[PDB]
Scaffold this active site. Structure first.
Site, short mmCIF file in Angstrom:
data_model
loop_
_atom_site.label_atom_id
_atom_site.label_comp_id
_atom_site.label_asym_id
_atom_site.label_seq_id
_atom_site.Cartn_x
_atom_site.Cartn_y
_atom_site.Cartn_z
N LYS A 10 -9.94 4.99 -6.29
CA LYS A 10 -10.73 4.13 -5.62
C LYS A 10 -11.71 5.03 -4.55
O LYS A 10 -11.52 6.25 -4.64
CB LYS A 10 -9.87 3.48 -4.56
CG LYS A 10 -8.97 4.23 -3.75
CD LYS A 10 -9.42 4.50 -2.44
CE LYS A 10 -8.66 5.61 -1.95
NZ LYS A 10 -8.95 6.44 -0.78
N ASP A 131 -1.49 3.81 0.46
CA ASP A 131 -2.64 3.43 -0.68
C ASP A 131 -2.30 2.92 -2.08
O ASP A 131 -3.08 2.24 -2.94
CB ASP A 131 -3.66 4.62 -1.03
CG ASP A 131 -4.85 4.58 0.10
OD1 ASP A 131 -4.79 3.87 0.86
OD2 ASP A 131 -5.55 5.77 0.11
C1 LIG Z 1 -7.33 7.79 3.90
C2 LIG Z 1 -6.70 6.66 2.92
O1 LIG Z 1 -6.93 7.59 1.62
C3 LIG Z 1 -7.79 5.49 2.99
O2 LIG Z 1 -7.52 4.85 1.78
C4 LIG Z 1 -5.42 6.49 2.91
O3 LIG Z 1 -5.16 5.84 4.25
C5 LIG Z 1 -4.18 7.59 2.78
O4 LIG Z 1 -3.13 7.21 2.05
P1 LIG Z 1 -2.23 7.90 1.29
O5 LIG Z 1 -2.93 8.76 0.53
O6 LIG Z 1 -1.06 7.04 0.48
O7 LIG Z 1 -1.16 8.53 2.46
P2 LIG Z 1 0.44 8.65 2.50
O8 LIG Z 1 0.75 9.77 1.42
O9 LIG Z 1 1.04 7.40 2.58
O10 LIG Z 1 0.32 9.25 4.09
C6 LIG Z 1 0.03 10.92 4.09
C7 LIG Z 1 -0.16 10.99 5.61
O11 LIG Z 1 -1.41 10.51 6.14
C8 LIG Z 1 -1.00 9.90 7.24
N1 LIG Z 1 -1.46 8.40 7.40
C9 LIG Z 1 -1.65 7.56 6.37
C10 LIG Z 1 -1.99 6.33 6.11
C11 LIG Z 1 -2.00 5.76 7.30
N2 LIG Z 1 -2.32 4.55 7.24
N3 LIG Z 1 -1.97 6.44 8.41
C12 LIG Z 1 -1.61 7.75 8.65
O12 LIG Z 1 -1.56 8.25 9.68
C13 LIG Z 1 0.34 10.11 7.84
O13 LIG Z 1 0.37 11.40 8.60
C14 LIG Z 1 1.12 10.47 6.59
O14 LIG Z 1 2.20 11.48 6.50
#
Ligand SMILES: C[C@](O)(CO)[C@H](O)COP(=O)(O)OP(=O)(O)OC[C@H]1O[C@@H](n2ccc(N)nc2=O)[C@H](O)[C@@H]1O
Ligand SMILES: Nc1ncnc2c1ncn2[C@@H]1O[C@H](COP(=O)(O)OP(=O)(O)O)[C@@H](O)[C@H]1O
Ligand SMILES: [Cl-]
EC number: 2.7.1.148
Length: 269
Positions: A10, A131
């Site tokens: 994405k 995500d």
């Molecule tokens: C930046 C984006 O890619 C936008 O779509 C996402 O919000 C990231 O989502 P993701 O990769 O699934 O992240 P996760 O592996 O769930 O979380 C990793 C870290 O990112 C931070 N995190 C993530 C999602 C969110 N809504 N708030 C956060 O503060 C947290 O510190 C977490 O420990």
């Protein structure tokens, strides 16, 4: 009986952060867009195994964590051998790991008679990756809450998009952790911005995590500056590292990418 499943990427067509949650996550608003850029996942009957072509350890793989949680919730033993050909680089802000987790767990659930409902599957992948629930929907969606509260939308966005992915892996956690009050916006502000983007006004795209990532990882800023020089408005997906623009790749960009170790992905929406 080996099968192949494609795991799409994405981009975020804009992202806004509303504030911190006591959990340590952040409340956000974003427009998710599934792009035709895929990992190839080969699923084989065998001893539980999750391997990649880029040296991600099994124990740290989101897919493996998801399958082990699947076993624990369901009591059913998972006898699948998983190999992922990782075209979508880690730390690129394209949700590659989240996509991997979602498509594998959706497939394995169906293969085993669907012991989990759509809702339970959503909660499972969601508990591991914010995500990941998007990748159970695909297409275009507004993501609210931590990103998992989804509203499918139809956008007026089409045509060429080029991704320029530097070698540097952006840490999602580190980028989110650098946020302070000045970076936050009201939901009313973000909500107006997203609706303009949905209606095709791509100039309205912004992403504060991109601003921060450009500061924390200078090479992301270099890509960004290079895209400007090429005559395009650059945008940042996720927390970086990917910069994208609405246009095709010139030979000059391809040359710069070759020399600098950037991955250039030309896509049509
Ligand atoms: C930046 C984006 O890619 C936008 O779509 C996402 O919000 C990231 O989502 P993701 O990769 O699934 O992240 P996760 O592996 O769930 O979380 C990793 C870290 O990112 C931070 N995190 C993530 C999602 C969110 N809504 N708030 C956060 O503060 C947290 O510190 C977490 O420990
Ligand atoms: N199947 C997977 N694909 C990609 N990254 C993974 C996977 N499993 C675990 N990871 C880890 O997650 C991080 C990057 O995941 P990714 O979803 O690409 O992040 P983002 O898209 O938010 O930048 C890396 O530190 C990587 O080691
Ligand atoms: Cl942006």
């Amino acid at each position: 009986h080996m099968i192949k499943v494609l795991s799409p990427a994405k981009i975020n067509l804009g992202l806004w952060v509303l504030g911190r949650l006591p959990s340590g996550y952040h409340e956000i608003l974003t427009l998710y867009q599934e792009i035709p850029f895929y990992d190839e996942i080969y699923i084989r009957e065998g001893v539980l195994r999750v391997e990649t072509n880029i040296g991600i350890p099994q124990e740290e793989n989101l897919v493996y964590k998801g399958l082990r949680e699947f076993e624990r919730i369901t009591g059913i033993e998972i006898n699948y051998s998983i190999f992922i050909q990782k075209n979508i680089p880690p730390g690129a802000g394209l949700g590659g790991g989240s996509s991997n987790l979602a498509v594998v767990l959706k497939k394995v659930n169906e293969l085993l008679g669907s012991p989990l409902s759509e809702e339970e599957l959503r909660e499972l992948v969601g508990s591991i990756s914010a995500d990941a629930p998007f990748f159970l929907l695909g297409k275009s969606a507004i993501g609210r809450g931590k990103g998992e509260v989804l509203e499918p939308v139809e956008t007026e966005i089409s045509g060429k998009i080029t991704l320029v992915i530097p070698q540097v892996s952006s840490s999602t956690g580190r980028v989110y952790s650098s946020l302070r009050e000045e970076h936050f916006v009201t939901p009313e502000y973000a909500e107006e911005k997203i609706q303009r983007i949905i209606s095709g006004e791509v100039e309205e795209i912004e992403n504060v995590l991109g601003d921060i990532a450009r500061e924390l990882y200078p090479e992301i800023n270099e890509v960004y500056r290079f895209v400007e020089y090429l005559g395009f408005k650059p945008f940042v997906s996720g927390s970086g590292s990917t910069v994208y623009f609405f246009g095709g790749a010139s030979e000059e960009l391809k040359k710069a990418a070759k020399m600098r170790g950037w991955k250039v992905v030309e896509l049509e929406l």
